[PDB]
C-alpha cells in the first residue's frame, strides 16, 4: 500500500497530492493532511510514501512549510523508526518570486525523514526550472520534484505522472 502524506495553507499541494492519488489509483491511500495525523506510527503501515509541501517561510533554518509538518517533524516524527522505507517528497514553490529559495522545505523534510532511518528516492534534475538558488539542491540533484504552480512553467500533470513512474520504477512496489 502507498501512502501520500502532505500539508497545505493555500490548497495547492493538496491539488497535488490528489493528482498522485489518481496517477496511482487503487495502489494508493486518499491523501492524509498531517495535520490529521493522531498516531505518527500510521506512516509504517506502508510499502511507500508521497511527502509533499509547499515552502512559507522564505529563508528559515527550520520550520519552512509554514504548514502542520512545522509541528510534526520535531514532535511526533522522532517517534517513528522508519528503516528501510522509502519516501518520495513533492514540494511547491515560486521559483520567479523566491530565486534564490525555491522549494526550500524539500531539504527540511529530507534531512528529517532520512534521520529516522527513510529512504529518499525520485531526485530530479536541478535544470527543470530556472531558479538561482536552493538548499534542495545537493550533489547535482533536488532532493524531491519542485513544482511551481503560481508560474505554471511546466504543466503539472505530465511532470507529475512522470515522477510518479519513475518512482515506482526505482522503489518496485
Ligand atoms: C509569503 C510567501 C512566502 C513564500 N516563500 C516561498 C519560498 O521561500 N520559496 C518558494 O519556492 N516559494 C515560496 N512561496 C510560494 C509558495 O510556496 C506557493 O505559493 C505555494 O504554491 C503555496 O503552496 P500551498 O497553496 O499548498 O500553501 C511563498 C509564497 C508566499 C505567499
Not at 515552502?55 to 528501510?84: H, Q
Not at 536541478?126 to 503560481?150: A, H, I, Q, T
Request: net charge negative; hydrophobic share 35%.
Amino acid at each position: 500500500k502507498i501512502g501520500i502524506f502532505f500539508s497545505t495553507s493555500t490548497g495547492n499541494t493538496t491539488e497535488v497530492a490528489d493528482f498522485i492519488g489518481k496517477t496511482l489509483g487503487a495502489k494508493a491511500d486518499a491523501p492524509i493532511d498531517v495535520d490529521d495525523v493522531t498516531d505518527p506510527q500510521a506512516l509504517k503501515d506502508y510499502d511507500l510514501l508521497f511527502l509533499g509541501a509547499p515552502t512559507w517561510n522564505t529563508g528559515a533554518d527550520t520550520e519552512r512549510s509554514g504548514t502542520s509538518w512545522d509541528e510534526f517533524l520535531y514532535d511526533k516524527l522522532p517517534e517513528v523508526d522508519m528503516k528501510d522505507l522509502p519516501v518520495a517528497i513533492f514540494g511547491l514553490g515560486d521559483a520567479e518570486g523566491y530565486p534564490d529559495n525555491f522549494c526550500d522545505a524539500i531539504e527540511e523534510i529530507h534531512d528529517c525523514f532520512a534521520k529516522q532511518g527513510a529512504k529518499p528516492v525520485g531526485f530530479s534534475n536541478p535544470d527543470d526550472y530556472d531558479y538561482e538558488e536552493s538548499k534542495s539542491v545537493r550533489d547535482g540533484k533536488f532532493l524531491g520534484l519542485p513544482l511551481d504552480m503560481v508560474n505554471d512553467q511546466i504543466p503539472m500533470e505530465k511532470r507529475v505522472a512522470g515522477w510518479v513512474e519513475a518512482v515506482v520504477s526505482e522503489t518496485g512496489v
